[PDB]
Amino acid sequence: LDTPVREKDENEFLPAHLELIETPVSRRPRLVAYFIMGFLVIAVILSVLGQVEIVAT
Amino acid sequence: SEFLLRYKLVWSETWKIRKQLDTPVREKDENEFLPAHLELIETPVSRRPRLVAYFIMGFLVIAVILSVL
Amino acid sequence: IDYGLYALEILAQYHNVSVNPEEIKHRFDTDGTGLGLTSWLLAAKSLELKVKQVKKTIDRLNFISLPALVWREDGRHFILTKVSKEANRYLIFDLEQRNPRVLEQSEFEALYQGHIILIASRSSVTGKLAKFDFTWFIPAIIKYRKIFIETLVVSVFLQLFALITPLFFQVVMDKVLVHRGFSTLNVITVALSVVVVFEIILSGLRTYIFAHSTSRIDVELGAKLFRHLLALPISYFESRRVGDTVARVRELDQIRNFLTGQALTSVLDLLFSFIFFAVMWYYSPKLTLVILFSLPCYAAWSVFISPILRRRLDDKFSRNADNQSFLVESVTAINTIKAMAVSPQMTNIWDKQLAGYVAAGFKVTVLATIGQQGIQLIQKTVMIINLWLGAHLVISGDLSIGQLIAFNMLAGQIVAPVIRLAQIWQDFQQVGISVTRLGDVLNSPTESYHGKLALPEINGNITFRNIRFRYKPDSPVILDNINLSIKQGEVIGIVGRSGSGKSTLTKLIQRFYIPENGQVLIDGHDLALADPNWLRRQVGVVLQDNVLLNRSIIDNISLANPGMSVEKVIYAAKLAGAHDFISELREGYNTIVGEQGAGLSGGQRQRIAIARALVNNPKILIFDEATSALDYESEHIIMRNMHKICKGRTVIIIAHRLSTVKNADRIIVMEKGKIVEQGKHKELLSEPESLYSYLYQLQS
Amino acid sequence: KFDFTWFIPAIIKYRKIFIETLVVSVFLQLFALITPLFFQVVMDKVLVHRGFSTLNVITVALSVVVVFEIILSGLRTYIFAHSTSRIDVELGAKLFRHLLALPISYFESRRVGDTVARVRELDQIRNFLTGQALTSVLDLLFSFIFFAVMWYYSPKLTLVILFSLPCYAAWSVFISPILRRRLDDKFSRNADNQSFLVESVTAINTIKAMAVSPQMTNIWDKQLAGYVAAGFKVTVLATIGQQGIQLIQKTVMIINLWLGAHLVISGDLSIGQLIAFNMLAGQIVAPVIRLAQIWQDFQQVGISVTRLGDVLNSPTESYHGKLALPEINGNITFRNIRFRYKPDSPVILDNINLSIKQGEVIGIVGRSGSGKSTLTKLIQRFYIPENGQVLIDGHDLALADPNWLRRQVGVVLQDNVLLNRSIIDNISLANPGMSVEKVIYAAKLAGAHDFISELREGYNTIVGEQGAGLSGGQRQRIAIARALVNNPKILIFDEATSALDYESEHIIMRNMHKICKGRTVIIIAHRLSTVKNADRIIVMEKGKIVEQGKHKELLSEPESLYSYLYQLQS
Amino acid sequence: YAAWSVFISPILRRRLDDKFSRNADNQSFLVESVTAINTIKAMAVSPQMTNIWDKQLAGYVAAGFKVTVLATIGQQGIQLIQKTVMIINLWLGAHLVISGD
Amino acid sequence: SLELKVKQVKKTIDRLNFISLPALVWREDGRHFILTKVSKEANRYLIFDLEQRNPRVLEQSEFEALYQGHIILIASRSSVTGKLAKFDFTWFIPAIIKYRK
Amino acid sequence: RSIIDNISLANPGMSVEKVIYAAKLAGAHDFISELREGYNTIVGEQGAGL
């Protein structure tokens, strides 16, 4: 995290490289969906395992 | 932790020189017609906002005193 | 050789698009050694072609659309024209042989390396008829639609999380406390922990992804803007200032930020406020109405406060910029301040400027404080009214305590988006002003060149024929019928008086001036049919006021091609006589030239400029007043080195002083645009009543 | 000496208003304590027992409390901004007045960029003391009241908060230096990009004259890519820093919710008590969140003030000796003058003896190293001779006010830097209140009126960045006009007519006959043609006056060095 | 409904600007090629004219399809609001009929 | 008009020590004089005599005889701003600000 | 179209060398050159500009 701007970072942002890459994608294209599906499965697991008491007045 | 003690010593020694270096008091017109920087340096804030702040604080104090009777 | 150029022009031939081979060589073949894969693709893209390198096998070539370029890794390429299966032959267009020829299966298998380039052309209606508007940015912004969709989805999920959390608080306060649960509490705690950790992670991911996309958009827009700015003609910059153009160029980031990080936020906020209002109206219509009635107070306060505060910030920024400029100009000119005794005057000016700037800052902070306090007062009033009404409702019914707490959270959350919308209303006008300001730069014609004869290398033969020139269509004629011919290796000299027109020949050799009548030609070739970028690089011009970049001496001299050798720099410096002080310097050729005038003298800078002009082998040198404003030492060394400078070159020495052209082969004398006298020095001086002798006597 | 001190005199200067700010902050904390107590009492005694009267009383009480809190906070901000503005103006005035008193040796030994950065540190000091940097430390000081109240409610729940605060401090300390370095890198890259853009714009004619547009585009692409990568790194670190604090705050909130739910179910806490405790926890945590930039700034301003003092820790060479010398006449005299640059340097000016009279046009010539270039700085009080004395009107210059002498002496150098102002502002720099007629007269004497009449704004034309709109000869003529704007009895031409072009040297040498009317003019020039009309041409070699006389008198003798130099020149 | 219409209208207007530009250029090409058909036949430049026509027609059809897609999604967005309000009204009406009133 | 800040004030001789000089003393008859360098410890005033056109040194008594109780204070307030605003209904906003009491 | 496009109408992809040769043969080189746009001058509708 403390490293300065390396040559990889500058090469990734060069206009020549960006112009050739048509229809680009994010750096990690499968992180948003992974986290959303993880949240969904954790929510389902908690809903099925979770227990709620019944109180009668 | 020796910066704080030196700050305290100089604070005290120049506090014993209090009122020797304070700016002279002037009226509004005298302050207005000064050089550009001197006018801003030597002009006190005001009397009205100070009065408003004192009134608010005094109202709070009298209210809390009256409520604990 | 340049199979890349030949292949590209053949492929432009097939698809009927305009190609400029020397322009392609200039822009994409800077150093040499052919184009290469990436620069060839860039040139094809610049020719409005669709190109892409793909992985295809020997059998998949029957389903592709020919012609296609087979990019060999080792040089010589070839164009696949037609693939045949009735005879199993591959008809290609051999580039080295410059003619098509037929191969067989084995020959193509040996030649084919597995990589081919697919080429296609589409139509376009853009041209240059579209006035500068937001349409200049849309093609570079729509390119990241998947990223923008991902960010929108993440924002949606985040705001559903923000809506969900108050329901968890409601369930806690309305079921865990009244009925001693100890079991629903644990489930709700786990759910809340999951919600908050996933909200944090999703916010971080959205910020990261959006930052990456906007950074790439900024890179593309800035690079293309700089290309357009450099493409503009000099007549554009003759009228405009420098700071004005720099400010207009820098005014691009505001437009980009508005287009990327304000429209998406607004379209999210509108829908999300709608959803929050629906939920709050489901909870309690009375408090929803109080909130709804406060909504115009926020909008009106924001709209009233924004313009005056913006004006105050603009004034403060201008004052700060002026103060910094005065400070930097006063510290760099301390020698003249101390040589005189103008210190009290400078202190007075500084005091006035500082007092003004500080007063502006105080006004800014006072106005900002007033605005913030007004917003907070509105919020507190709404909170008090809602507290009263909610307490009454809970006492009566139709609303439990947890319902009131959840409604309070939602009402506190929903405050910001309406303020953001009220602000973007005027942000649109501000960005419109920025766009119309940038239209001064990005709407001007790019001054390109369509059809050139693609001339060979220049040797120094210059000839004028019937040249007539005016500065303006109404201005008087500067050159009447100038007719002049210069042979290779001739060291010519031109003298005259003010308004003689000798100062326009430099801009007539290069194509900065278009003659009204006649045409200038080099080597028998009219310059109207030659690419100027091919000509400007073959002519060395030295003026009396040269500008050198703030990189280094070794880079300033080698500005034409930084990847070139070093010893040639030493040879050029020796030729111009600049080797001495460079060697004497601390770092040598790696010494920083400084910002404006640090270290190097005017004559030394002129010698550096001469060396930079001479670093290549220009067959045509033009000394346009190059030794006019030089001190004695620099002028002496330049005049001593002149005899070896003009070796194998055609040198034109334009000078007002007649003593600098004594050793010239020919001395052209001009009067009001006419060559009145010509010849050598002594032959011209022999005649007593000649103009050359009269001027020589007048000057000395 | 300048340090973190010199503010204690300013603070004690502004005693009463600062004490008013402190007491106003205390009362703001009192109001912020009062409001959650009102919420707690409403939720405990109005909802449980029907208390419409209690709700009615509390509504108006809380309304007046919140209105007064708003007004009081606004007034505190106003007063603090006023005080800090006064302090900033005093700082700036003192700093600039001290900077303009430093000797030339200080500036010539250092770079202008370093000095201007060390001075613009004043601007970042202003930004330090004119923002929320000083209004949050007082909140941190006064948050102990809220902490005590929270301990009064429940000793277990506030233990979580007091364990959370060290986590905030530790993680902010962990994050801040990296973000500092990334921001510094981004700022440096942005400055480099701006400089490259402006220099490319200024030299567009040179770029197009050659074929170097692709090279400029390649340079700009690399610069832009680097700057954008630095900005992306800055954004990533900033968002990580924000998310960490958010995570800590939310974890503490969840733990407090769980423990408070168990306590309320068991006892020792009500519901309104829990709500008030949560509000107090938030109001304590928020200033600690804001203090992150304060930890950053209390360490940045350290080196900031250290460098500013390094500028301010230098003698000002203030002059305390002046014999009230009268207005000078034009008679310079040298007596046994010996001078070296440094004590270890060789002598350049050995034993010159000179005597110049009023109204005399005296010229000085010589080759390189002749020592004639040090006479102009010897007449001014910039070079101190080792032996002898330079005396004007008979009065020794070593016992005189140098500023007065430099007022009385006008010198035209070869560089002649101009300020970025109007032409009439540059000409009348020494006296801005002077009449325009004198400026016109000086411009006509210098020959600068004719080309000024042809400009876009006349005498109001901005010369540009040290002179950009005018040529070299035009700027030289403007400098001559500035030197002649007063009535100097002594005028020096230190190779002023050397490094300019024709049609500009011609006018100066043609007007030289009327420039030197009633003045003692010294013309130091390398060329021997400019001093032809001098009353006493002096040739000097190695600091020795070999010969002196008129042009014809000196040239008629073939063995004279004057004739040898004239032959070399021609 | 108002917000959906306001959001969708500018994009449709931009797409129709592009479509009209395509249509105007196609009409200009058609008029210029039919008026000078004698030159086209004499010079035997039919393949070039056909290639230009194919490019222009493909661009025009692409623009028209984009406009059609945007109009379809706008209509479906309005249908969604209509049907959501229908479902909400059905639920609320069922409750408001069960309890008298 | 010259971008100065002036206003005539009633100033007592005792209060005359605390104003910023130079200041103009306006008399009913056209015999004004500029006051400069009011000297403490010597009760002397360095006026600028407008009739004699040179500075002259006075003492306390003749200054008290020559001073009537009114002085004009001069300050340099040059506004650095160049712009002209379009005349609209917004022109009345500065008028409302000026007449705000 | 432009002058060079009209001259090279029968084959739009043709180099300027053949255009120059043909213009010299037809005697139109001079007038086209004397123009400001040279061989890039737009003739208008049905060559109305010429």
Tab-separated table of C-alpha atoms in Angstrom, chain C residues 120-365:
chain	number	residue	atom	x	y	z
C	120	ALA	CA	-13.638	-3.580	-41.576
C	121	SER	CA	-14.968	-0.107	-42.359
C	122	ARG	CA	-18.257	1.524	-41.351
C	123	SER	CA	-19.983	4.828	-42.085
C	124	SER	CA	-19.852	8.046	-40.085
C	125	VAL	CA	-21.875	11.258	-40.025
C	126	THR	CA	-19.793	13.222	-37.500
C	127	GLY	CA	-17.264	15.052	-39.663
C	128	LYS	CA	-16.690	18.531	-38.260
C	129	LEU	CA	-20.213	19.971	-38.518
C	130	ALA	CA	-21.214	19.203	-34.909
C	131	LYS	CA	-20.967	22.256	-32.665
C	132	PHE	CA	-19.085	21.689	-29.417
C	133	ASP	CA	-21.467	20.347	-26.767
C	134	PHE	CA	-21.652	17.361	-24.394
C	135	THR	CA	-21.548	15.141	-27.490
C	136	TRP	CA	-17.744	15.519	-27.414
C	137	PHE	CA	-17.608	13.340	-24.272
C	138	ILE	CA	-20.377	10.737	-24.746
C	139	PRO	CA	-18.396	8.330	-27.006
C	140	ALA	CA	-15.664	8.073	-24.347
C	141	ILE	CA	-18.166	7.687	-21.485
C	142	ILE	CA	-20.516	5.058	-22.950
C	143	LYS	CA	-17.409	2.889	-23.436
C	144	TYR	CA	-17.597	1.912	-19.730
C	145	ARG	CA	-21.277	0.966	-19.577
C	146	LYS	CA	-20.689	-2.384	-17.847
C	147	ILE	CA	-18.698	-0.634	-15.114
C	148	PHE	CA	-21.398	2.011	-14.718
C	149	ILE	CA	-24.085	-0.695	-14.515
C	150	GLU	CA	-22.093	-2.476	-11.801
C	151	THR	CA	-21.775	0.765	-9.831
C	152	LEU	CA	-25.515	1.419	-10.172
C	153	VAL	CA	-26.337	-2.083	-8.908
C	154	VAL	CA	-23.974	-1.680	-5.947
C	155	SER	CA	-25.557	1.675	-5.081
C	156	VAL	CA	-29.024	0.106	-5.244
C	157	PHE	CA	-28.008	-2.684	-2.869
C	158	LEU	CA	-26.343	-0.203	-0.504
C	159	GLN	CA	-29.483	1.911	-0.258
C	160	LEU	CA	-31.670	-1.143	0.322
C	161	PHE	CA	-29.277	-1.931	3.186
C	162	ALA	CA	-29.728	1.613	4.506
C	163	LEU	CA	-33.500	1.144	4.294
C	164	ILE	CA	-33.345	-2.285	5.966
C	165	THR	CA	-31.360	-1.268	9.066
C	166	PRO	CA	-34.141	0.855	10.682
C	167	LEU	CA	-36.473	-2.143	10.386
C	168	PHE	CA	-33.995	-4.185	12.430
C	169	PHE	CA	-33.946	-1.414	15.037
C	170	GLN	CA	-37.765	-1.398	14.982
C	171	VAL	CA	-37.968	-5.151	15.546
C	172	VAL	CA	-35.502	-4.931	18.437
C	173	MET	CA	-37.354	-2.080	20.154
C	174	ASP	CA	-40.818	-3.596	19.592
C	175	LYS	CA	-40.241	-7.325	20.230
C	176	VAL	CA	-37.028	-7.872	22.216
C	177	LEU	CA	-37.854	-5.462	25.060
C	178	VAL	CA	-41.585	-5.971	25.682
C	179	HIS	CA	-41.207	-9.760	25.433
C	180	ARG	CA	-37.971	-11.014	26.989
C	181	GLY	CA	-36.569	-12.800	23.966
C	182	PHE	CA	-32.816	-13.521	24.238
C	183	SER	CA	-33.238	-15.441	20.940
C	184	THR	CA	-34.574	-12.905	18.446
C	185	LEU	CA	-31.928	-10.543	19.827
C	186	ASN	CA	-29.105	-12.853	18.734
C	187	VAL	CA	-30.599	-13.361	15.265
C	188	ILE	CA	-31.050	-9.617	14.778
C	189	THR	CA	-27.508	-8.947	16.016
C	190	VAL	CA	-26.089	-11.434	13.506
C	191	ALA	CA	-28.218	-9.972	10.707
C	192	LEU	CA	-27.141	-6.420	11.569
C	193	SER	CA	-23.470	-7.427	11.668
C	194	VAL	CA	-23.769	-9.085	8.255
C	195	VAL	CA	-25.599	-6.066	6.831
C	196	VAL	CA	-23.056	-3.534	8.085
C	197	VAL	CA	-19.966	-5.495	7.028
C	198	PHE	CA	-21.382	-6.139	3.558
C	199	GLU	CA	-22.444	-2.492	3.237
C	200	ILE	CA	-18.903	-1.371	4.083
C	201	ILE	CA	-17.353	-3.844	1.640
C	202	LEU	CA	-19.766	-2.891	-1.149
C	203	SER	CA	-19.182	0.838	-0.615
C	204	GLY	CA	-15.435	0.280	-0.841
C	205	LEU	CA	-15.776	-1.835	-3.983
C	206	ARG	CA	-18.054	0.712	-5.662
C	207	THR	CA	-15.671	3.568	-4.878
C	208	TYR	CA	-12.686	1.576	-6.168
C	209	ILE	CA	-14.378	0.528	-9.414
C	210	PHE	CA	-15.840	3.963	-10.167
C	211	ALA	CA	-12.481	5.609	-9.458
C	212	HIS	CA	-10.752	3.250	-11.897
C	213	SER	CA	-13.305	3.883	-14.652
C	214	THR	CA	-13.271	7.664	-14.207
C	215	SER	CA	-9.462	7.670	-14.142
C	216	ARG	CA	-9.342	5.877	-17.493
C	217	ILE	CA	-11.936	8.279	-18.930
C	218	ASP	CA	-9.850	11.222	-17.700
C	219	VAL	CA	-6.717	9.797	-19.329
C	220	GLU	CA	-8.439	9.327	-22.687
C	221	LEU	CA	-10.113	12.746	-22.699
C	222	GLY	CA	-6.962	14.582	-21.627
C	223	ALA	CA	-4.765	12.881	-24.215
C	224	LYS	CA	-7.210	13.550	-27.051
C	225	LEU	CA	-7.645	17.167	-25.911
C	226	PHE	CA	-3.874	17.683	-25.932
C	227	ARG	CA	-3.640	16.180	-29.423
C	228	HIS	CA	-6.318	18.581	-30.663
C	229	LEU	CA	-4.607	21.524	-28.949
C	230	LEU	CA	-1.275	20.767	-30.616
C	231	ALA	CA	-2.991	20.262	-33.983
C	232	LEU	CA	-4.233	23.870	-34.023
C	233	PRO	CA	-2.534	26.398	-36.334
C	234	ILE	CA	-0.288	29.156	-35.032
C	235	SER	CA	-2.756	31.872	-36.086
C	236	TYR	CA	-5.064	30.620	-33.325
C	237	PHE	CA	-2.389	31.237	-30.685
C	238	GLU	CA	-1.295	34.568	-32.185
C	239	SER	CA	-4.438	36.272	-30.844
C	240	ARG	CA	-5.126	34.379	-27.612
C	241	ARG	CA	-3.090	34.697	-24.423
C	242	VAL	CA	-1.251	31.873	-22.634
C	243	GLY	CA	-3.023	31.770	-19.276
C	244	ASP	CA	-6.406	31.920	-21.008
C	245	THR	CA	-5.671	28.828	-23.111
C	246	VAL	CA	-4.207	26.990	-20.112
C	247	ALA	CA	-7.305	27.766	-18.035
C	248	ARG	CA	-9.615	26.615	-20.831
C	249	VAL	CA	-7.641	23.370	-21.137
C	250	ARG	CA	-7.773	22.835	-17.363
C	251	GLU	CA	-11.539	23.476	-17.398
C	252	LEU	CA	-12.062	19.880	-18.670
C	253	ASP	CA	-12.004	18.092	-15.306
C	254	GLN	CA	-15.096	19.947	-14.070
C	255	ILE	CA	-17.096	18.844	-17.118
C	256	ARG	CA	-15.860	15.264	-16.759
C	257	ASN	CA	-16.752	15.213	-13.055
C	258	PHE	CA	-20.236	16.572	-13.737
C	259	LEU	CA	-20.830	14.033	-16.501
C	260	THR	CA	-19.582	11.031	-14.512
C	261	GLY	CA	-20.116	11.558	-10.780
C	262	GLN	CA	-23.130	13.851	-10.690
C	263	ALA	CA	-25.642	12.535	-13.236
C	264	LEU	CA	-25.524	8.965	-11.908
C	265	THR	CA	-25.815	10.203	-8.326
C	266	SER	CA	-28.815	12.337	-9.312
C	267	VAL	CA	-30.660	9.543	-11.123
C	268	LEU	CA	-30.036	7.313	-8.105
C	269	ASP	CA	-31.184	9.970	-5.630
C	270	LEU	CA	-34.469	10.697	-7.415
C	271	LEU	CA	-35.647	7.073	-7.420
C	272	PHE	CA	-34.274	6.432	-3.938
C	273	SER	CA	-36.056	9.460	-2.482
C	274	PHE	CA	-39.231	8.190	-4.158
C	275	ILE	CA	-38.794	4.817	-2.435
C	276	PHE	CA	-38.039	6.412	0.940
C	277	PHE	CA	-41.111	8.646	0.642
C	278	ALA	CA	-43.272	5.619	-0.148
C	279	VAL	CA	-41.974	3.815	2.943
C	280	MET	CA	-42.421	6.832	5.227
C	281	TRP	CA	-45.946	7.429	3.924
C	282	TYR	CA	-46.665	3.791	4.730
C	283	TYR	CA	-45.485	4.394	8.304
C	284	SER	CA	-47.259	7.676	9.065
C	285	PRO	CA	-48.727	10.184	6.574
C	286	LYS	CA	-48.691	13.103	9.055
C	287	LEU	CA	-44.939	13.097	9.678
C	288	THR	CA	-44.379	12.295	6.006
C	289	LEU	CA	-46.200	15.472	5.313
C	290	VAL	CA	-44.069	17.450	7.703
C	291	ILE	CA	-41.007	16.139	6.006
C	292	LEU	CA	-42.568	16.882	2.643
C	293	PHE	CA	-43.351	20.411	3.666
C	294	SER	CA	-39.825	20.966	4.820
C	295	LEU	CA	-38.549	19.872	1.384
C	296	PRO	CA	-39.103	23.328	-0.245
C	297	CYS	CA	-37.330	25.102	2.615
C	298	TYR	CA	-34.186	23.061	1.922
C	299	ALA	CA	-34.470	23.634	-1.825
C	300	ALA	CA	-35.031	27.390	-1.536
C	301	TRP	CA	-32.256	27.856	1.029
C	302	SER	CA	-29.745	25.913	-1.072
C	303	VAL	CA	-30.711	27.756	-4.268
C	304	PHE	CA	-30.484	31.145	-2.525
C	305	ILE	CA	-27.164	30.437	-0.794
C	306	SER	CA	-25.258	28.736	-3.635
C	307	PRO	CA	-24.648	31.660	-6.067
C	308	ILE	CA	-23.400	34.257	-3.573
C	309	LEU	CA	-21.131	31.702	-1.904
C	310	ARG	CA	-19.777	30.652	-5.309
C	311	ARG	CA	-19.042	34.298	-6.135
C	312	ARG	CA	-17.227	34.729	-2.814
C	313	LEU	CA	-15.101	31.633	-3.462
C	314	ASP	CA	-14.280	32.847	-6.980
C	315	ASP	CA	-13.200	36.248	-5.648
C	316	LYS	CA	-11.077	34.643	-2.926
C	317	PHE	CA	-9.436	32.290	-5.434
C	318	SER	CA	-8.600	35.161	-7.787
C	319	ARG	CA	-7.135	37.211	-4.929
C	320	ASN	CA	-5.040	34.253	-3.762
C	321	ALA	CA	-3.743	33.623	-7.287
C	322	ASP	CA	-2.768	37.279	-7.688
C	323	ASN	CA	-1.064	37.315	-4.277
C	324	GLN	CA	0.938	34.177	-5.099
C	325	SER	CA	1.945	35.625	-8.474
C	326	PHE	CA	3.103	38.860	-6.836
C	327	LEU	CA	5.070	36.926	-4.213
C	328	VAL	CA	6.813	34.697	-6.758
C	329	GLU	CA	7.627	37.667	-9.000
C	330	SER	CA	8.973	39.651	-6.033
C	331	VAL	CA	11.212	36.864	-4.739
C	332	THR	CA	12.703	36.126	-8.182
C	333	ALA	CA	13.457	39.836	-8.766
C	334	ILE	CA	15.084	40.683	-5.441
C	335	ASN	CA	18.271	41.894	-7.152
C	336	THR	CA	16.484	44.820	-8.812
C	337	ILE	CA	14.496	45.594	-5.649
C	338	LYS	CA	17.658	45.787	-3.539
C	339	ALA	CA	19.625	47.611	-6.252
C	340	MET	CA	16.932	50.276	-6.051
C	341	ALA	CA	15.241	51.115	-2.740
C	342	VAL	CA	11.643	50.358	-3.689
C	343	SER	CA	11.161	48.030	-0.700
C	344	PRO	CA	8.593	50.330	1.017
C	345	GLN	CA	6.455	50.437	-2.138
C	346	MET	CA	6.507	46.650	-2.487
C	347	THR	CA	5.623	46.266	1.193
C	348	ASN	CA	2.680	48.645	0.725
C	349	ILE	CA	1.431	46.668	-2.283
C	350	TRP	CA	1.839	43.398	-0.379
C	351	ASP	CA	-0.031	44.777	2.636
C	352	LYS	CA	-2.947	45.922	0.478
C	353	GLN	CA	-3.147	42.589	-1.354
C	354	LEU	CA	-2.884	40.544	1.852
C	355	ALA	CA	-5.574	42.586	3.602
C	356	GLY	CA	-7.901	42.189	0.625
C	357	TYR	CA	-7.351	38.433	0.412
C	358	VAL	CA	-7.873	37.940	4.152
C	359	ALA	CA	-11.079	39.992	4.062
C	360	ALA	CA	-12.318	37.869	1.153
C	361	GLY	CA	-11.565	34.684	3.087
C	362	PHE	CA	-13.399	35.973	6.155
C	363	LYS	CA	-16.436	36.835	4.027
C	364	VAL	CA	-16.328	33.341	2.501
C	365	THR	CA	-16.238	31.584	5.866
